[PDB]
Symmetry: C3
Subunit: 95 residues, 3 copies
Amino acid sequence: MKKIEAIIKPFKLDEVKDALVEIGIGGMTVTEVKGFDFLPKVKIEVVVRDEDVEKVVETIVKTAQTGRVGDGKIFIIPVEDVIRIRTGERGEQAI
Amino acid sequence: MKKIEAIIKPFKLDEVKDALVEIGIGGMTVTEVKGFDFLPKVKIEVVVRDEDVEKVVETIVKTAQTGRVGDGKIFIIPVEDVIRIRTGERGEQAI
Amino acid sequence: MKKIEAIIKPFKLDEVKDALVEIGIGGMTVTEVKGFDFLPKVKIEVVVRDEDVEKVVETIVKTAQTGRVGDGKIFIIPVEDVIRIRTGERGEQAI
Ligand SMILES: [Cl-]
């Protein structure tokens, strides 16, 4: 599994969120952040199976790219385990 | 060492924080975030020795689980080094 | 590449940000967080080439260290890929 962390322009949040839900993303975490003066951005984090990473990356790029400066970046970070707090299920069972 | 990132319901913050302090957690970072409409959640991050990961995971699960939807998830991410800014100490010496 | 995540005192933000820009950091993400009562802190994230990690760590330590309690910590986390949303460039080309 991998954590996908994307820093995007605030106004692109609803479009990226919808596009991700369309391709089957079960959950996501959003944080208000600042970046580059410091400009407001939105950080999205989703953790997915290794085999779903590329589709997610493509979708975020297609949806948030405007062609102008400050569109953001996407980081792929390794995740060694995921645990669902409600059930205690782990790994694939916890998504 | 591993970074443990848990996304929980806001109201469970004081209980999880206390339970973690009880099992010896020296420090933690908390961020206000939104997730799943977007609902408010609390993100907790602690970085601990490999041998302390499971105890921390169990404690968070026991403390934040309500059995209802949206209890959250816990991600275990690898950390290659930790540096204490005040002293410059690293690794085990920086916790 | 590696993600460098540093939790610092709020007042040190402008100095650390400037010092990092001086050593060639192209971008950074800042989040308002709380840590240790919970005290306000600032989280900085930069993702850099493996060979630039130590210089960045040194710079953050030199700039944010006051010698007092609560100066913070720096975590080095592995990043398997970086994608620039504006162009779709990856890895070294996406910084
Ligand atoms: Cl991370």
